[PDB]
Design a protein around this ligand. Structure first.
Ligand SMILES: [Zn+2]
Ligand SMILES: [Zn+2]
Lengths: 100, 102
């Protein structure tokens, strides 16, 4: 119906919204946007590996509370290309507000 | 560009409402006014006070999280300000806007 905005559950800093949505994965309790507020988010230095060894990602932090709230996938197999270099956030670390 | 904004208390970032409940706003008071806000986002203080020009009566609005005074509810007005009355009138100096992307 009506779009949503998304915030860190700790400090409430808005990290982006529905209109940059790409896909979600209830499997991993994640969701993925194509865009996000530059200043409210930080991609960390270290490349790290999915639990199944197959992907590489950098952690995402909220620039206000420094919680790790997501990941940016840098290396993927074919089938996870839609995620790659997108902002992939953890549902448990975020809150949605819908506009009504 | 036809895209909504969302509003938050500058201090804690609690969202208090959005553009879709918009009503009117006033450049000379650096304020804006909404017909709705998030249910538990906001507290009306029980003191009743007067505009600088003696004319209206408002109670202060506080952010239930950060206790900051962020606005007011005009309880009593003349005819012309009947738009404002019993509506959430926010202080632009104390709020923040986030306009969504496309
Ligand atoms: Zn945060
Ligand atoms: Zn606040």
């Amino acid at each position: 119906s009506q779009p949503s905005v998304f915030q860190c559950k700790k400090c409430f800093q808005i990290v982006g919204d529905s209109n940059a949505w790409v896909i979600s994965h209830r499997e991993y309790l994640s969701f993925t946007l194509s865009d996000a507020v530059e200043n409210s988010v930080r991609v960390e230095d270290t490349f790290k590996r999915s639990d199944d060894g197959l992907c590489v990602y950098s952690e995402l932090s909220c620039t206000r509370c420094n919680e790790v709230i997501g990941k940016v996938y840098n290396s993927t197999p074919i089938y996870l290309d839609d995620i790659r270099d997108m902002y992939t956030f953890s549902m448990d670390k975020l809150q949605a507000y819908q506009l009504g």
